[PDB]
mmCIF file of C-alpha atoms and ligand atoms in Angstrom:
data_model
loop_
_atom_site.group_PDB
_atom_site.id
_atom_site.type_symbol
_atom_site.label_atom_id
_atom_site.label_comp_id
_atom_site.label_asym_id
_atom_site.label_seq_id
_atom_site.Cartn_x
_atom_site.Cartn_y
_atom_site.Cartn_z
ATOM 1 C CA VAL A 1 49.522 -10.916 144.833
ATOM 2 C CA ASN A 2 46.336 -9.383 145.100
ATOM 3 C CA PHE A 3 45.543 -6.971 148.058
ATOM 4 C CA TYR A 4 42.428 -8.413 149.118
ATOM 5 C CA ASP A 5 43.786 -12.125 149.082
ATOM 6 C CA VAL A 6 46.641 -11.165 151.404
ATOM 7 C CA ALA A 7 44.030 -8.897 153.446
ATOM 8 C CA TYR A 8 42.075 -12.304 153.890
ATOM 9 C CA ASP A 9 45.157 -14.245 154.900
ATOM 10 C CA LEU A 10 45.550 -11.256 157.281
ATOM 11 C CA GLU A 11 42.164 -11.761 158.918
ATOM 12 C CA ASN A 12 42.989 -15.643 159.335
ATOM 13 C CA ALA A 13 46.389 -14.527 161.120
ATOM 14 C CA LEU A 14 44.250 -12.199 163.546
ATOM 15 C CA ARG A 15 41.578 -14.799 164.073
ATOM 16 C CA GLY A 16 43.998 -17.324 164.977
ATOM 17 C CA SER A 17 46.347 -15.228 167.198
ATOM 18 C CA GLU A 18 46.845 -15.934 170.530
ATOM 19 C CA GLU A 19 46.214 -12.100 171.401
ATOM 20 C CA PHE A 20 42.557 -12.445 169.774
ATOM 21 C CA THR A 21 42.208 -15.492 171.818
ATOM 22 C CA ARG A 22 43.235 -13.512 175.072
ATOM 23 C CA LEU A 23 41.004 -10.560 174.241
ATOM 24 C CA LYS A 24 38.019 -12.752 173.572
ATOM 25 C CA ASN A 25 38.838 -14.765 176.961
ATOM 26 C CA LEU A 26 38.815 -11.489 178.817
ATOM 27 C CA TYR A 27 35.604 -10.521 176.871
ATOM 28 C CA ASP A 28 33.924 -13.631 177.995
ATOM 29 C CA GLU A 29 35.221 -13.467 181.603
ATOM 30 C CA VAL A 30 33.785 -9.931 182.104
ATOM 31 C CA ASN A 31 30.601 -10.852 180.438
ATOM 32 C CA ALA A 32 30.352 -13.645 182.769
ATOM 33 C CA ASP A 33 30.560 -11.623 185.793
ATOM 34 C CA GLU A 34 27.283 -10.136 186.445
ATOM 35 C CA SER A 35 28.536 -7.196 188.319
ATOM 36 C CA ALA A 36 31.529 -6.347 185.866
ATOM 37 C CA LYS A 37 29.297 -7.030 182.824
ATOM 38 C CA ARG A 38 26.927 -4.063 183.904
ATOM 39 C CA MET A 39 29.777 -1.710 184.653
ATOM 40 C CA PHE A 40 31.680 -2.650 181.188
ATOM 41 C CA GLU A 41 28.132 -2.140 179.411
ATOM 42 C CA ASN A 42 27.208 1.267 180.925
ATOM 43 C CA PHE A 43 31.043 2.288 180.224
ATOM 44 C CA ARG A 44 30.485 1.437 176.810
ATOM 45 C CA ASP A 45 27.053 3.041 176.460
ATOM 46 C CA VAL A 46 28.011 6.072 178.018
ATOM 47 C CA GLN A 47 30.376 6.628 175.054
ATOM 48 C CA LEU A 48 28.523 7.818 172.377
ATOM 49 C CA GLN A 49 30.124 12.385 183.825
ATOM 50 C CA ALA A 50 32.201 10.689 180.965
ATOM 51 C CA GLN A 51 35.247 10.750 182.135
ATOM 52 C CA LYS A 52 34.413 9.520 184.142
ATOM 53 C CA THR A 53 32.577 6.442 184.194
ATOM 54 C CA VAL A 54 35.759 5.685 183.174
ATOM 55 C CA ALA A 55 36.939 6.194 186.623
ATOM 56 C CA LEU A 56 34.363 3.630 187.679
ATOM 57 C CA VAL A 57 35.660 0.842 185.513
ATOM 58 C CA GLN A 58 39.218 1.574 185.655
ATOM 59 C CA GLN A 59 39.346 0.856 189.576
ATOM 60 C CA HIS A 60 37.964 -2.916 188.929
ATOM 61 C CA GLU A 61 40.915 -5.158 188.035
ATOM 62 C CA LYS A 62 39.690 -7.515 185.452
ATOM 63 C CA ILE A 63 37.763 -4.951 183.363
ATOM 64 C CA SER A 64 40.812 -2.958 183.229
ATOM 65 C CA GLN A 65 42.898 -5.891 181.853
ATOM 66 C CA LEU A 66 40.040 -5.978 179.125
ATOM 67 C CA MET A 67 40.384 -2.530 178.380
ATOM 68 C CA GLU A 68 44.297 -2.806 178.186
ATOM 69 C CA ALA A 69 43.863 -5.670 175.837
ATOM 70 C CA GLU A 70 41.749 -3.532 173.695
ATOM 71 C CA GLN A 71 44.188 -0.868 173.730
ATOM 72 C CA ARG A 72 46.601 -3.117 172.596
ATOM 73 C CA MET A 73 44.459 -4.500 169.920
ATOM 74 C CA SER A 74 44.096 -1.017 168.694
ATOM 75 C CA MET A 75 47.759 -0.414 168.959
ATOM 76 C CA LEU A 76 48.170 -3.841 166.782
ATOM 77 C CA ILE A 77 45.892 -2.524 164.149
ATOM 78 C CA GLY A 78 47.716 0.677 164.182
ATOM 79 C CA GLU A 79 51.336 -1.200 163.686
ATOM 80 C CA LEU A 80 49.860 -3.046 160.741
ATOM 81 C CA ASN A 81 48.528 -0.028 159.169
ATOM 82 C CA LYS A 82 51.900 1.776 159.657
ATOM 83 C CA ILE A 83 53.535 -1.231 157.919
ATOM 84 C CA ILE A 84 51.232 -1.328 154.973
ATOM 85 C CA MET A 85 51.106 2.344 154.513
ATOM 86 C CA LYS A 86 54.870 2.511 154.278
ATOM 87 C CA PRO A 87 54.848 3.131 150.427
ATOM 88 C CA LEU A 88 52.511 6.035 150.732
ATOM 89 C CA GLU A 89 54.627 7.596 153.468
ATOM 90 C CA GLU A 90 57.799 7.379 150.862
ATOM 91 C CA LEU A 91 55.768 8.770 148.256
ATOM 92 C CA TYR A 92 54.791 11.916 150.189
ATOM 93 C CA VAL B 1 50.440 -17.727 160.110
ATOM 94 C CA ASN B 2 52.229 -14.808 162.047
ATOM 95 C CA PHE B 3 50.236 -11.558 161.566
ATOM 96 C CA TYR B 4 53.489 -9.435 160.667
ATOM 97 C CA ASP B 5 54.612 -11.638 158.227
ATOM 98 C CA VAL B 6 51.137 -11.423 156.443
ATOM 99 C CA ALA B 7 51.327 -7.759 156.846
ATOM 100 C CA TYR B 8 54.647 -7.376 155.032
ATOM 101 C CA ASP B 9 53.072 -9.487 152.225
ATOM 102 C CA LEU B 10 49.968 -6.820 152.264
ATOM 103 C CA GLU B 11 52.763 -4.114 152.008
ATOM 104 C CA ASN B 12 54.260 -5.737 148.993
ATOM 105 C CA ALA B 13 50.823 -6.211 147.257
ATOM 106 C CA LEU B 14 50.204 -2.676 147.812
ATOM 107 C CA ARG B 15 53.508 -1.653 146.357
ATOM 108 C CA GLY B 16 53.122 -3.736 143.645
ATOM 109 C CA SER B 17 49.514 -2.721 142.783
ATOM 110 C CA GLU B 18 48.178 -0.677 139.556
ATOM 111 C CA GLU B 19 46.590 1.555 142.057
ATOM 112 C CA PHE B 20 49.717 2.520 144.001
ATOM 113 C CA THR B 21 51.175 3.064 140.431
ATOM 114 C CA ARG B 22 48.483 5.239 139.406
ATOM 115 C CA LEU B 23 48.794 7.458 142.286
ATOM 116 C CA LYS B 24 52.390 7.766 142.184
ATOM 117 C CA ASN B 25 51.934 8.723 138.447
ATOM 118 C CA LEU B 26 49.781 11.527 139.198
ATOM 119 C CA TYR B 27 51.566 12.572 142.324
ATOM 120 C CA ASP B 28 54.833 12.732 140.037
ATOM 121 C CA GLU B 29 52.638 14.581 137.312
ATOM 122 C CA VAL B 30 51.478 17.153 139.595
ATOM 123 C CA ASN B 31 54.662 17.650 141.125
ATOM 124 C CA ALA B 32 56.346 18.074 137.281
ATOM 125 C CA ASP B 33 53.816 21.116 136.726
ATOM 126 C CA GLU B 34 55.191 23.890 138.214
ATOM 127 C CA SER B 35 51.613 25.615 138.773
ATOM 128 C CA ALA B 36 50.018 22.512 140.011
ATOM 129 C CA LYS B 37 52.840 21.819 142.697
ATOM 130 C CA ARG B 38 52.358 25.087 144.020
ATOM 131 C CA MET B 39 48.609 24.883 144.249
ATOM 132 C CA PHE B 40 48.634 21.363 145.748
ATOM 133 C CA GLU B 41 51.552 22.030 148.155
ATOM 134 C CA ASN B 42 49.610 25.229 149.152
ATOM 135 C CA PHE B 43 46.807 23.296 150.037
ATOM 136 C CA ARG B 44 48.503 20.485 151.789
ATOM 137 C CA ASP B 45 50.334 23.175 153.902
ATOM 138 C CA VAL B 46 46.933 24.981 154.741
ATOM 139 C CA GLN B 47 45.982 21.578 156.211
ATOM 140 C CA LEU B 48 47.606 21.744 159.675
ATOM 141 C CA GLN B 49 40.237 30.245 154.386
ATOM 142 C CA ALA B 50 40.698 26.751 154.499
ATOM 143 C CA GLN B 51 37.583 25.417 152.921
ATOM 144 C CA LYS B 52 38.545 26.881 150.777
ATOM 145 C CA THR B 53 42.063 26.622 149.541
ATOM 146 C CA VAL B 54 39.882 23.419 148.776
ATOM 147 C CA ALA B 55 37.994 25.401 146.058
ATOM 148 C CA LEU B 56 41.331 26.610 144.318
ATOM 149 C CA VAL B 57 42.373 22.889 143.844
ATOM 150 C CA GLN B 58 39.361 21.307 143.045
ATOM 151 C CA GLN B 59 38.813 23.685 140.015
ATOM 152 C CA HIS B 60 42.173 22.074 138.425
ATOM 153 C CA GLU B 61 41.281 19.090 136.702
ATOM 154 C CA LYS B 62 44.730 17.026 137.182
ATOM 155 C CA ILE B 63 45.215 18.092 140.893
ATOM 156 C CA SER B 64 41.381 17.041 141.312
ATOM 157 C CA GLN B 65 42.398 13.375 139.720
ATOM 158 C CA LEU B 66 45.410 12.861 142.138
ATOM 159 C CA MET B 67 42.793 14.034 145.090
ATOM 160 C CA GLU B 68 40.362 11.696 143.715
ATOM 161 C CA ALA B 69 42.902 8.845 143.710
ATOM 162 C CA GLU B 70 44.092 9.745 147.220
ATOM 163 C CA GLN B 71 40.767 9.485 148.500
ATOM 164 C CA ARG B 72 40.200 6.234 146.680
ATOM 165 C CA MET B 73 43.582 4.896 148.498
ATOM 166 C CA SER B 74 42.233 6.145 151.560
ATOM 167 C CA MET B 75 38.841 3.762 151.027
ATOM 168 C CA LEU B 76 41.246 0.894 150.136
ATOM 169 C CA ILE B 77 42.985 1.134 153.494
ATOM 170 C CA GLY B 78 39.499 1.464 155.065
ATOM 171 C CA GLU B 79 38.328 -1.702 153.116
ATOM 172 C CA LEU B 80 41.396 -3.708 154.417
ATOM 173 C CA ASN B 81 40.625 -2.508 158.050
ATOM 174 C CA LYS B 82 37.138 -3.770 157.806
ATOM 175 C CA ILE B 83 38.526 -6.929 156.487
ATOM 176 C CA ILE B 84 40.932 -7.680 158.969
ATOM 177 C CA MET B 85 38.650 -6.254 162.097
ATOM 178 C CA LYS B 86 35.919 -8.640 161.338
ATOM 179 C CA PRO B 87 36.665 -10.773 164.138
ATOM 180 C CA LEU B 88 36.562 -8.012 166.552
ATOM 181 C CA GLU B 89 33.220 -6.976 165.228
ATOM 182 C CA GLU B 90 31.824 -10.406 165.714
ATOM 183 C CA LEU B 91 33.312 -10.347 169.471
ATOM 184 C CA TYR B 92 31.389 -7.128 170.408
HETATM 185 CA CA1 LIG C 1 45.720 -3.699 186.665
HETATM 186 CA CA1 LIG C 2 37.264 15.700 137.153
#
């Protein structure tokens, strides 16, 4: 099959996953909370005193849950990459 | 559908692609050439005077073709990632 055809099926799988729904719900929940929205945004912005700002946000339970869901999404993408890149690892 | 189910279909798509076959053929061709194998290996090894070693290998046509095929494979993985991560970009 075509690599791009499958990639679009994989995008759909991600779009439809409970994991994406959970991340989206946390993201919306944080944005609906005026205090949390501001803290999360100032955190995001400071990443382009750091370290920081990370302490500010980690002390907030709901924002921490969102950040944890972000890191788990990053881990998932990492897993997908390890899966699909196996033939390259075999080669080298 | 399940994200992992599709990821394994995508691994199969990559395994079966002419692009993978081309990379593998170049890799094997370089390794079958005693002089080129040594240059490519010393290059790979120097990456963990650099810059370098990169000049050594780029002056060899066949090794350069392999390195170009590597970079195009990296670009392909990049494209797949951009595709599947679109729902995340929409969210943020
Ligand atoms: Ca917690
Ligand atoms: Ca050339």
